[PDB]
């Protein structure tokens with residue numbers, strides 16, 4: 256019963272304008288043996304058809320439309336609840352081209368393993384061919400992809416997370432390049448066999464071939480493992496492209512800040528997961544005359560324009576956010592984005608009237624059905640109602656403070672790049688780099704307590720190539736650029752704590768005051784202290800008007816203590832040794848310079 260190429264249903268009616276794509280699909284279909292092949296078009300009628308089928312399969316339940324229109328809740332197999340690092344590989348030809356932040360395997364060996372897994376993996380399933388565009392369609396030469404998947408769940412979320420379907424397919428023309436992205440949940444079915452709501456496999460791989468720009472995923476239907484745009488393309492493959500083609504693919508939010516004189520500024524900020532970020536991208540300023548709009552909260556792609564400035568575009572089309580922690584008081588604009596519906600919730604809790612709830616959200620519901628389908632009772636049940644890593648998947652276009660430039664293929668000019676992590680000591684609230692190479696060093700040595708892990712540019716699990724070569728790439732772009740047009744680089748810390756354990760700086764909206772200092776520095780309208788680590792404002796350099804806070808706590812937040820920084824040195828030094836032979840001299844230079852300035 257193994258079926259050949261042109262007898263698999265849906266293959267005879269396949270679009271044929273792009274022969275490379277069609278040959279690839281046929282080769283894949285021959286291998287995985289699905290019941291049928293469907294090319295998705297991203298239309299609303301298709302979206303509803305797939306959602307209905309998801310409801311019928313039990314994968315989705317339809318949420319009360321009075322509270323979220325066109326919205327769904329999906330509960331995963333508990334063994335498949337997140338992105339898995341140790342199962343993620345960069346399979347460059349040479350191990351050194353993956354380097355010490357990456358998991359490597361010989362690509363010939365990986366292909367032998369995965370090709371074996373893929374054989375007959377789609378039996379009894381529909382194989383979807385999902386064309387998609389990264390970034391606005393308006394671009395002349397955008398980065399395109401096609402995800403083949405046996406997961407309908409994946410198709411629906413890809414429609415939200417990328418520009419999916421007919422348009423992207425047309426953009427590929429007859430011979431356009433695209434990233435081949437292959438995915439299976441690894442759960443073949445016999446004829447007539449009852450599926451489960453969330454199929455998956457104990458055997459999981461998430462593999463990237465940087466040279467050919469390919470992504471092979473198997474065994475997981477969840478998140479970044481399966482939505483191949485989200486990190487696999489946006490960061491892993493894209494960063495390798497950017498390396499070769501002279502640009503930057505980064506783990507950054509893009510923020511639009513507008514001053515009281517009505518001038519707009521655009522900032523990119525690299526914070527690791529949970530150092531957010533989502534909150535900064537959706538800032539509501541607490542000082543009069545300042546407004547903020549968002550272009551994105553996770554990925555930024557940046558290229559130098561004609562005028563020598565650095566321009567950023569958000570390559571994604573949707574938000575894929577962590578639900579718990581999100582609430583109306585901390586992040587009302589995120590909540591309003593969600594409130595407009597068209598959202599897929601994964602692993603949150605269900606209320607009695609078909610709303611959704613997760614830990615930290617308002618309401619105090621008395622009874623819930625939790626993320627595993629069990630009864631949950633307020634102030635009694637000892638387990639979390641929602642999975643701690645549960646998700647919302649929501650269109651970007653519903654964000655009430657979406658910047659009008661959000662879908663512009665030309666991008667936005669970046670004035671400032673920010674780096675930050677969770678540091679309870681040592682790092683001050685905000686610091687400005689001395690120049691580009693010092694900013695690269697700051698990015699390169701970014702620490703976050705999540706005992707301090709180094710997470711360079713928030714890219715630790717996401718680099719598509721050797722971390723040292725990546726630092727060198729950052730260095731090279733600044734050396735060959737007009738220094739006057741380069742974004743200024745800043746180093747922030749929202750999480751410094753006093754001895755009594757409280758946050759020295761209140762943060763959230765109040766971070767607008769830090770952003771105001773940053774803008775003034777770019778305009779040369781503010782001063783600061785020259786310290787061994789960079790330019791750090793004193794309390795009197797910050798607008799603290801109307802902020803109910805002890806000025807002493809602010810001074811403490813801004814302090815540069817040499818003893819603390821001397822303890823930081825060997826930690827940094829050991830990280831630079833870990834970076835290995837490809838550590839750029841330029842980075843080591845900045846280490847020595849900082850050490851010398853410290854005395």
Ligand SMILES: Nc1nc2c(ncn2[C@@H]2O[C@H](COP(=O)(O)OP(=O)(O)O)[C@@H](O)[C@H]2O)c(=O)[nH]1
Nearest residue numbers: 526527528529530531532533534580749762763
């Ligand atoms: N103390 C403090 N915590 C914050 C601040 N901004 C975000 N956090 C908290 O850090 C967590 C993660 O924030 P989030 O923006 O969702 O992070 P992301 O994953 O980088 O997008 C949430 O629990 C926030 O309440 C801040 O400015 N100050």
